[PDB]
Amino acid sequence: GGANGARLALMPQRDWDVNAAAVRALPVLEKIQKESGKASLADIIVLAGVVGVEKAASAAGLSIHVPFAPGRVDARQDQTDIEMFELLEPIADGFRNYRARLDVSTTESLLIDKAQQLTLTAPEMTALVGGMRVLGANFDGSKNGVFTDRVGVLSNDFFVNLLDMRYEWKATDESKELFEGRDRETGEVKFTASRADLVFGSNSVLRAVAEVYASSDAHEKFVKDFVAAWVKVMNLDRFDL
Amino acid sequence: PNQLRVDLLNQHSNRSNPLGEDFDYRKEFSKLDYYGLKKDLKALLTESQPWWPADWGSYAGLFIRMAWHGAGTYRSIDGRGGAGRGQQRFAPLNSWPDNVSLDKARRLLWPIKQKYGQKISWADLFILAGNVALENSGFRTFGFGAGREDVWEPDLDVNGLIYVNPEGPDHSGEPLSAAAAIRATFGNMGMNDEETVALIAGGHTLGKTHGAGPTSNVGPDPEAAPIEEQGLGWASTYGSGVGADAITSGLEVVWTQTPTQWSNYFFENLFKYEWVQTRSPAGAIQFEAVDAPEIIPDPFDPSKKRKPTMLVTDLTLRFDPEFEKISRRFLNDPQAFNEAFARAWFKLTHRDMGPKSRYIGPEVPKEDLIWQDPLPQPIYNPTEQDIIDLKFAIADSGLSVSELVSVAWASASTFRGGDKRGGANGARLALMPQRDWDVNAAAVRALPVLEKIQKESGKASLADIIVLAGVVGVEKAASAAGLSIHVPFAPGRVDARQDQTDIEMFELLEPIADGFRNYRARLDVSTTESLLIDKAQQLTLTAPEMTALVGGMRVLGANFDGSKNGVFTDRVGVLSNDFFVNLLDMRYEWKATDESKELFEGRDRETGEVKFTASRADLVFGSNSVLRAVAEVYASSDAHEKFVKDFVAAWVKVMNLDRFDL
Amino acid sequence: PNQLRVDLLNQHSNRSNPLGEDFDYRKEFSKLDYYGLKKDLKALLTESQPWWPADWGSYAGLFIRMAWHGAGTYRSIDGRGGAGRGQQRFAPLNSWPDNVSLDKARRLLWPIKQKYGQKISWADLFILAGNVALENSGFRTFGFGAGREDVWEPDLDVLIYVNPEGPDHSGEPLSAAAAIRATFGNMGMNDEETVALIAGGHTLGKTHGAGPTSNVGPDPEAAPIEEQGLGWASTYGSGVGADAITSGLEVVWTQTPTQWSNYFFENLFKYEWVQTRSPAGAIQFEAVDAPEIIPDPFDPSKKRKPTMLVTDLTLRFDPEFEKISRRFLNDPQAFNEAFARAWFKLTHRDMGPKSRYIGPEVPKEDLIWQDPLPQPIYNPTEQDIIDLKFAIADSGLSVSELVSVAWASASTFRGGDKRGGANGARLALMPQRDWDVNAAAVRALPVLEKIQKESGKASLADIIVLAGVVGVEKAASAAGLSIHVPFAPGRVDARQDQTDIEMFELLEPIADGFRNYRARLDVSTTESLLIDKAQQLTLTAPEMTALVGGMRVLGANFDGSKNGVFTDRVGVLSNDFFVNLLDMRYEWKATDESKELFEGRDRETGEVKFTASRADLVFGSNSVLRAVAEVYASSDAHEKFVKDFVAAWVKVMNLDRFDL
Ligand code: HEM
Ligand code: HEM
């Protein structure tokens, strides 16, 4: 797996359920790559994320440098065996609120399993979930777990809103993968979430990291931690480096 | 002869430090048995070494002199010299005519120094030796502050004597003419009339002067004698050469009759007895109390006495109408004398030490003084949200990248390295006289906004908000060039009062030139590029640091008066390497506009049209080869992120130079 | 006037580096598109800038001259100068009389340099520019090795060869022979190599002198700041192009002035010569009774008859050179062979061992002036080294002797041209075996050689450095301050067939302050010689101080005298040297007028307890040095002295480990 090769552009990943929205940014980048014949589409694809994160950090008054390692290459359809790559399709990607079937495991166990496959630590997984939530990186762009009003700015709003005893959370149906937050005083409904947003206030080891990021001295800290974890996940398949 | 001294910027590197680059003097000092060291020093005060016998069994008169000569090379105009760096141990100062026999004083200190190691530094040990010497004669001290950390190279600055000829001006034994000499020399050190009286009268109550025979008996200074002399100069063929034959100044004066006890006898004799003219054996003019008995015990022979005597320089006070009044003030009240002398002595030995946050140890006085440039305790404690909020506010104020950077630089760049004065702590940019200086005129136009942002937010001080404005400006300009970076910010500065900013001692901090903003005042003083070096040295920068900052400040448009001298770009306000690229590009030829060649036009060598202008401060970076060697690094094709990081690090270094509180 | 240049020791610190102290030149070079750079340089060779137009459209004769002038400041006696550090860019050399117009040659290189960055260094770029210039004219090169890493200060530790107009401006080619011979020999070139170099260097290009020399303005370090780094401006005509004045003469040697050929010798012998002068009134030699065949560099309708320099006719009229010159006259392939060998040499002579060469054109033939080393026939394991240490420990050599042999082998390294060091075991071969200073150390060789026969697991260079390791570890244990002394294995022993005695006799010390050896008493002062030795080792003043003191207590005196042995436990590593040196108990008197020996007596009893030389006693006379002495003599500095001495020792053991 990984970002080297630009398999997102070839089959079968172009056409996977979870990739559906992300794919709407492909034809622009491809064009930016014809006009510039100076990089490959794998490098331009990772650079797009670099620009997005730097913009969002500037919006929160916490500007940071996002490192970029160039030199990826684009592979050819002939080197991408669809049957071998169909095994790489996620049954669940908690980091973007995609779960496929409802008879395999729990959403939060699948979250752990995904994070392990990425060789992350528990802090790393916590920081990334929260960041991806404020940046609005939901597949299908729903507002599950978007605990903020400045969608696209990289703040600690997710942990602050998740932990503050203002809202009580109710489950909407017998499925129990969807919950509403309402204010424990007025009753109104301000947020929605899934089991992947809400394990971070139920498991005590995870909540112990949430609180670190939700505390008063953890703005620059959350930004640095998220940026380091992001760059680590950008570079996992760079064995050429 | 006519050479840039870029080699100023290389001094005090990793190569010459015999200790680590991790040695923390403060932490070593924490281990010092400070009062046990004072015990061993007072012990030494009377342990008489045969190669240099003690006068009246007491080296005290010797130590006070050595500490006073240390401190007395200070200059108020730039902050160089003084006793803050221990420099009296190295050449050239160790060998100047005025320090004959001070190598003995330094030599006699080596056993204490050796027992204690780096836990005290030579530069602290000297001043403390003088203090203990005073405290052991009956006199009481104002207090002492350690913290002078030692260095390992002799500072190449520009400087014979310390203040005046002891023998009247031009060796003409008239006390009258000596008055103006003393006045000028001591004033340029920052002392007024009364302080001069107290110092010269106190310094001359203890000890004596040495001159048994012809000076020709004395050998070469320490940096000129045979290698077997092992660091000691001024050997003497007269009699023993030492003891009662010691010859240093050449004159033989003893001022009191208890030459090892404090008293009020200097003034007493000064006015009581009249005086006649003679000369000590070495043919130098002397004044001796006339019609007096024998009262002064002789330093080595008991059964012998001498009638009071004086130096020409001792007789300006009491005669120059001005000084007489302070001197009789003190004659008829020695408690005033003691108080004034002690305050002046503390001052003299702590004037190039800087803000009270640099003082360490258990005798640091509690009274704040005006020559300390004092700062008040803080009434603010900004949180993290408060800072993000201030940054949104300043960003949304309408100041341009140019203006924001201008105010931050104008506030920080007053720091000197020599005596540790200036810097951004205190908000002196807002008070007199800096609000009204020529170079600050434009930067000042961003003050009334920030002050308002500071009323609305009562969460930080104006010094912190002033440095934060520059932080916002630099972060914006880095984002414009596609090279976004984090600009570090250290909060916790405090705003001072006009009551702590003596306009007279801050008018010495006014730049004659700030090459980093294209301001040069007068045209008779130096070259623009040597003034640039001098400014950078005062900031303790390296040549790369100075290069990166000049270029950055040029693209951000940080010119005072905001002219287009050296603005080699079209995107003014974005932080690119455009300055070095256009500067080195053989496309443009540069011509001088007039005979006062401080202005040049660039026209393209093809069409001939004029695209840029510059001054000598922009164009040394393509004429001096050491500087151009760094320019090319920044102008090369792999050096965009590099230039941004280097400029940001140098900026933050110049923001934090006066943060000794940290 | 009479100073101790301790200030030499401070150069090249963190403060003046604009690149950081992590920059690995080798690793940056790994990224270079080396052949694409060669393509861009070849492009440059013919792209003519209006402010210095190209002769015959070609800047090649300019770049060969720049590269040769770079390399030609070398000296064989110490290893200073040369082209290994890029120094031709800085003062003073950038402004010397003999480098006029090489500032424009360096300026024309800046676009390539800028496109490439730190991937190539100025000091490599120069030599490669000259190479490409040669390769584009028809001539073939021996090979090229990059690796010259750039520096940022002008080296304070110090007429490139001869005057073209005969010695003392007397236009007699005869007298110029001895001048050429001496000057080129100082560089380690023999007769044939000199002939080849001069004759080759003078086939491409020309000399410039349209008008009077007074039209030329001041050198780069004296000109107005608007000149932006270029000197020698000219009021004559255009001042540039066909009006260029640099040297001042007007000589063109061939008729295809941009193609390789054999015409230099051809016309040299194939014409008599008359004496004229170029327009600037300088002596020239003119091929007499000749036609018009030399194309004019900027007018395609004028011609000129061959011409020569006095220094070109020396290698013809002189009897000695005539024979090599005719050898080559009747054999131009021999000419190409010899010139190319000599040119590779001239540009790689201060580069050092083949392990310092990088890039894809490094020749494969080892040469003698490279000081070659063979491939290793040993790979010692960890037990093998513990075993050798038990063996050496149990041999019966004293701490003094062991330390003596290790130091005697390592201390030949110079920093300038990178020669010497402990790799190779030249201490065992000629001529170092029989050098004066080595006499005592040699008495520990026959033991180690035997330990090296019994064990066939390491080389004698490794066993020699290991002996010093054991000695220092023992001495630290004696002082109650036990420490680990690092060892890097993998040295190789060289063969007498690779140790040219003549070029290793240049490595003999006139003085080694660290073991109390001086040779002659009319060269310099003992303490300035000490500084000079320490600089050649690239040490800092603290490093030099710590090592002198340590070597004194370990008793590492050559001849094992007791000059400066300020202790009673000789062989234990204490700070006794600095403590006794500084303690005001003893007064020091000089024994005679040749004041290099002094007695210490007690200033109280008067008895004589120590002796010393000027090399022991500068450390209490110079104030910068005494400032470090006191650090080591102070009460909290026992472990500190041990660690500092051990680090400096290991640094001097590893100076020539460019293989690592
Ligand atoms: C107008 C300013 C001054 C002049 C002209 C002056 C002159 C002299 C001279 C000529 C000596 C004799 C040196 C020798 O032969 O050993 C001396 C000694 C001495 N000076 Fe001053 N001095 C001045 C200021 C001061 C100050 C400001 C202090 C202390 C704050 C001071 C402290 C001493 C002491 C204690 C001695 C006695 C030296 C001994 O016992 O060996 N002097 N002075
Ligand atoms: C006896 C030794 C030498 C003498 C006396 C000498 C002298 C000269 C002089 C006077 C010039 C004219 C410079 C000018 O006006 O531009 C010149 C040019 C030149 N030198 Fe030499 N040189 C010597 C050795 C060498 C060597 C060893 C080389 C190369 C290996 C060399 C390569 C060149 C070249 C290529 C030029 C042509 C310059 C051009 O085209 O601008 N020279 N030489």
As for the number of domains of chain A, it is 2
Largest interface: B-C, 68 and 70 residues
Q: What is the C-alpha radius of gyration of chain A, as a whole number of Å? A: 19 Å
**Quaternary assembly:** part of a larger assembly
Structural class of chain A: mainly alpha
Give the N-terminus to C-terminus distance of chain A in angstroms.
Answer: 16 Å
What is the overall silhouette of chain A? globular
Largest sheet of chain A: 3 strands, antiparallel
DSSP E strands of chain A, number: 5
Could you estimate the helical fraction of the residues of chain A in percent?
25-40%
Tally of DSSP helical segments of chain A = 9
Provide the spatial order of strands within the biggest beta sheet of chain A: 3-4-5
Provide the β-strand percentage band of chain A.
5-15%
Give the H and E element order of chain A. Answer: HHHEEHHHEEEHHH
- Write out the distinct hetero groups bound to the structure: protoporphyrin IX containing FE
Subunit structure (chain A): Homodimer or homotetramer.
Function (chain A): Bifunctional enzyme with both catalase and broad-spectrum peroxidase activity.
Protein name (chain A): Catalase-peroxidase
Family (chain A): Belongs to the peroxidase family. Peroxidase/catalase subfamily.
